[PDB]
Amino acid sequence: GRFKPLAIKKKYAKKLKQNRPVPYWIRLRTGNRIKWNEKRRHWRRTKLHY
Amino acid sequence: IRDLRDKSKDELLKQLMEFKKELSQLRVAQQLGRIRLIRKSIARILTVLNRNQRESLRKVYAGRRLRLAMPKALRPKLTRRRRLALKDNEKNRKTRRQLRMARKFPRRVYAVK
Amino acid sequence: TKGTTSMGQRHGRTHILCRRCGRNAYHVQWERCAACAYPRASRRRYNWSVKAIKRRRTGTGRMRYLKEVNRRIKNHFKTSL
Amino acid sequence: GSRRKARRAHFQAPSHVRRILMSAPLSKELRAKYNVRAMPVRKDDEVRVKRGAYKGREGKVTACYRLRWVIHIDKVNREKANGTTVPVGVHPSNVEITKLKLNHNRKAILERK
Amino acid sequence: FIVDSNANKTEIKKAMRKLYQVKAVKVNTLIRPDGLKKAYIRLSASYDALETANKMGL
RNA sequence: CAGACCUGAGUGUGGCAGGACUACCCGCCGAACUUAAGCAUAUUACUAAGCGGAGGAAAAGAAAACAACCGUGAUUCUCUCAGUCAGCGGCGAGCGAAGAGGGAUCCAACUCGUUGCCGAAUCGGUUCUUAUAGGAACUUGAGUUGUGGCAAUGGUGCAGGAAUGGUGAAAUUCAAAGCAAACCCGUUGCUACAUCAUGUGAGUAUUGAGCCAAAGAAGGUGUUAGCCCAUUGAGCCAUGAACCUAAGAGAGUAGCACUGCUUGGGAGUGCAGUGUCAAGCUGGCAGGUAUGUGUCUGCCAAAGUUAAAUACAGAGUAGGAAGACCGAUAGCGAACAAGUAGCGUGAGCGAAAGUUUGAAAAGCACUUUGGAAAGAGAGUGACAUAGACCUGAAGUCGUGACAAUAAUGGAAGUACCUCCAUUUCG
RNA sequence: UGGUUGGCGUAGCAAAGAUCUAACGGAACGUUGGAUACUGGAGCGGGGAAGGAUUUCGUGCCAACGGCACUCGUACACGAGUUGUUCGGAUACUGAGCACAACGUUACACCGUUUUUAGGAAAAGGGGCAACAGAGAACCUGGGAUUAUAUUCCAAAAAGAAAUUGCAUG
RNA sequence: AACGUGUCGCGAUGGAUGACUUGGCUUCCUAUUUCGUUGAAGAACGCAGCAAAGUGCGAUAAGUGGUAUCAAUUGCAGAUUACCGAAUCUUUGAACGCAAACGGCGCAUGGGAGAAAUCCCCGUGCAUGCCAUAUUUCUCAGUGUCG
Ligand SMILES: [Mg+2]
Ligand SMILES: [Mg+2]
Ligand SMILES: [Mg+2]
Ligand SMILES: [Mg+2]
Ligand SMILES: [Mg+2]
Ligand SMILES: [Mg+2]
Ligand SMILES: [Mg+2]
Ligand SMILES: [Mg+2]
Ligand SMILES: [Mg+2]
Ligand SMILES: [Mg+2]
Ligand SMILES: [Mg+2]
Ligand SMILES: [Mg+2]
Ligand SMILES: [Mg+2]
Ligand SMILES: [Mg+2]
Ligand SMILES: [Mg+2]
Ligand SMILES: [Mg+2]
Ligand SMILES: [Mg+2]
Ligand SMILES: [Mg+2]
Ligand SMILES: [Mg+2]
Ligand SMILES: [Mg+2]
Ligand SMILES: [Mg+2]
Ligand SMILES: [Mg+2]
Ligand SMILES: [Mg+2]
Ligand SMILES: [Mg+2]
Ligand SMILES: [Mg+2]
Ligand SMILES: [Mg+2]
Ligand SMILES: [Mg+2]
Ligand SMILES: [Mg+2]
Ligand SMILES: [Mg+2]
Ligand SMILES: [Zn+2]
DSSP: OOOOOHHHHHHHHHHHHTOOOOOGGGGGSTTOOOOSOTTOOOTTSSOOOO | OOHHHHSOHHHHHHHHHHHHHHHHHHHHHHTOOOHHHHHHHHHHHHHHHHHHHHHHHHHHTOSHHHHTTSOTTTSOOOOHHHHHSOOHHHHSOOOHHHHHTTTSSOOOOOOOO | OOSTTTSSSOOSOSEEOOSSSOOSOEETTTTEETTTOTTSSSOOOOTTOHHHHHHHSTTSSOOTTHHHHHHHHHTTTOOOO | OOHHHHHHHHHTOOHHHHHHHTEEEBOHHHHHHSSOSEEEOOTTOEEEEOSSTTTTOEEEEEEEEGGGTEEEESSOEEEOTTSOEEEOOOOGGGEEEEEOOOOHHHHHHHHTO | OEEOTTOOHHHHHHHHHHHSOOOEEEEEEEEOTTSOEEEEEEEOTTSOHHHHHHHTTO
């Protein structure tokens, strides 16, 4: 609903902008290991219960 | 950057605001390369500028009389223990008897043929 | 109806995030943390669970200052005048 | 000493360590001019590869790519599938400095070596 | 403007007055779902928001 | 009554405490599982968990110790004493030490109170000397309801060192597969495969010749490298502080009764509670069986500090050395963005994952079909049945060809096939 | 422990009545029109709490997922989006309650009372918290204002009209 | 015939194996080695030109400064590495001005902007307990003791 302490909004805000595909250019670095983001989250699956 | 230190207080402060005013404008441009180079020049001026104050409060509180009155951000932090520990000044103290009984029998050097 | 139909009966939260540990272990009704034991000053720590002592001990985080003071003890607290 | 330690100290070398650890032998004309044996590689010192497919191929050092332990040469390159030509890496111990790029610091490296 | 999230409205007025030299008849901020604060500052009619925004490199 | 003191507040001022860590260590707390072939005492165990606390160790320590000697001489530790002809114990299961002795460590000792002789000599603060000196002046401020002494350094200066770092050596990128069957002869002799079409990565390999070595010591480099690179030696080099040059002698104490725990400790090892409660004009405590008594021996408790030898049995910081260890279902849970994802209301639980293509990305441009994914060519590379991927098993499946007609199985033949062996030109 | 298997293209994917048509789109289910039903105001309606936390919106996408399919999606990617003197909350109520302090008890506070054998006023009974459904609570409409927010946005003829708090001003 | 069975050749699925190993485990050592109210450890939120995670850092934010070192970093773009003295170190947290699912609210002090003062931002102090002290000796309370 509407209610959120801003501290919770800052955290969902945190996880929200953290919920992004890895940059394309990061995969092109030497010795790179990363491909997909292993910490992609989906609201319908993992829950950030705050 | 040595030139950044020759500047006086306000000459720095005036030199600083023109960086922020120009760092901001790169941020405007960004929304639509020097921004790092600016951001670290602002950091240089705060470094030089925050140094003159600590270098001029160590100057205000120099001398034994005020050294106890010193702001403790300026007081020589060690570890909580190095500060609370007995100093050699009071550590090596020995009772007057001991002081005399160590003079009367000094650890005289010797060898045995 | 003790199964899936009573899972719908459960609506609240027992625990919100703690102000200290950041764990979702702050029992909102008994305003304390199940994890850190917060607001109690001394943090919760049991020897029957060292997997948890280990889990949240020093070095688990930034050791933000402790890195600075460790470097200093190693350098005899060498100092510029 | 031990292999994990020795072999880790290499693949986790600082760029500091990589420039020395990724040095090249001087060619005899220099190893006569200077009593130096091998000297760390740098941009713009001419070199000839002496091992691998590009054996015998002289060329200037376009870049010391220390993160890749290689040393791109102006002449040591190959066409990509798209036709863009790209430098091909080479390991400096495989080459021979034919003409090192002198200056004030580098001169001292020679004088103290 | 995205504006510092801890800043309040009166401070955003005083900041527009100083950064862009223009009065803000009002400044109703919101903090974005992302966590940035966002001010819609409306300029006084005496100040164009258009002449000023283009002066601003926009 | 003004004050004075005593008692107690309130602020100001200067400080500290609280948290973390807690492997080890100190104090308390305190199980049970287990064992006893049951089980209660016992055992597990004075352990785990629990609480509280330290430090780089801690605790212990300078005799109210042992012995019974030709006597030793703080503590800790260690080997042994000793799994004990000690001892405890349903005397069962079991438990179980100490003296001495060898050793480590150890130029290891001291301080109060008291007694006696003094009696503010003290302390704190202020100022001061380049100094919150172990200095000096000054202070009622504290302190005679007893500080302290007696007997029973600070300031400034130079250097060196050490220690860390900083630097720093040799020599091929030399030359181009074998046989001669101990070494010497011998630095010498002699020796294709799958008309067309491609195909052999890198030379640390082989050989031949040298070469360095106070360095052969392992790593890197496209193959196995003393000599391609890096490493270290000497020698130098720098540095912020630091580091090295007559009297007395402890009282709710010790003891004792009861209780309780505890211990090998046994008519009591230590302790605790409560009651009781000394002595110091044949003192007191120990002298491992109680009591009363007499000798003798060692000691002198009830206050304090104290390095080293020791612990680190799920710690840290900064480094280092290793291995008959594991080798990716192993080794830590974790070789990886691992205490991560994920899970649980929570306390908590908790993975899998080798980006090991290649020497290098040279990571398949371009053509072609396809809406695409993709496919067919082409290209790279030594190899792409090396294609984002070393190897590439089994099992399973697809396909081609082939033999064929409960399963498997054994024996023996025979039919057909055999990229198999051997033999024969026997 | 990993992988694989027969069963097996099987068992099923049968609760809530439903789609039809043309045109267009597309590489081939959507979109619009029409038709047809359904929900049937205790609604497959319109708003909220809890909860969720980007699901919102637009463009694109449809590899994977949406147990059939998708051209569509709550999926994927990219870019957007949430505006307040007056709404709610806090500032500022008390309540069942809770607990800091102190004090007490405990080998120990991580216990208890909740005032303290107690000098709690700093300019008679210490401090605090505890209700987004209780108490409190100054704002309304219109909009041609969005892709997405509005009792929040609108601009000088504020579309406008108010009320209200603080200070100050005649 | 078919299916099914079976052999063989290829191929797929699968991921064993072998080799590899910047990891673990164990042992040993060293030392000027042991956090915090001078704000610790932990937690949060942030900071890069493209940066989610991890790492680094803290509005001076993948760093400022000192030192050495050198010519790089390197996916692209654009013009470092190592160490350590000076700093910087956001919200918190023992957390301490009061609270707290509130990015809330104070009092005092100084600053700032600003403005017709009110508002608004900022810095510093402000928890409790205890010890010391009142050094120019603070103010007091008691039918405590006296005078
Ligand atoms: Mg669900
Ligand atoms: Mg929520
Ligand atoms: Mg139930
Ligand atoms: Mg219920
Ligand atoms: Mg708002
Ligand atoms: Mg503590
Ligand atoms: Mg039994
Ligand atoms: Mg324990
Ligand atoms: Mg001790
Ligand atoms: Mg002691
Ligand atoms: Mg002895
Ligand atoms: Mg026992
Ligand atoms: Mg005395
Ligand atoms: Mg007694
Ligand atoms: Mg016992
Ligand atoms: Mg005595
Ligand atoms: Mg493993
Ligand atoms: Mg393979
Ligand atoms: Mg069927
Ligand atoms: Mg109907
Ligand atoms: Mg949508
Ligand atoms: Mg999405
Ligand atoms: Mg009440
Ligand atoms: Mg309330
Ligand atoms: Mg209400
Ligand atoms: Mg309201
Ligand atoms: Mg809407
Ligand atoms: Mg990041
Ligand atoms: Mg607080
Ligand atoms: Zn918590």
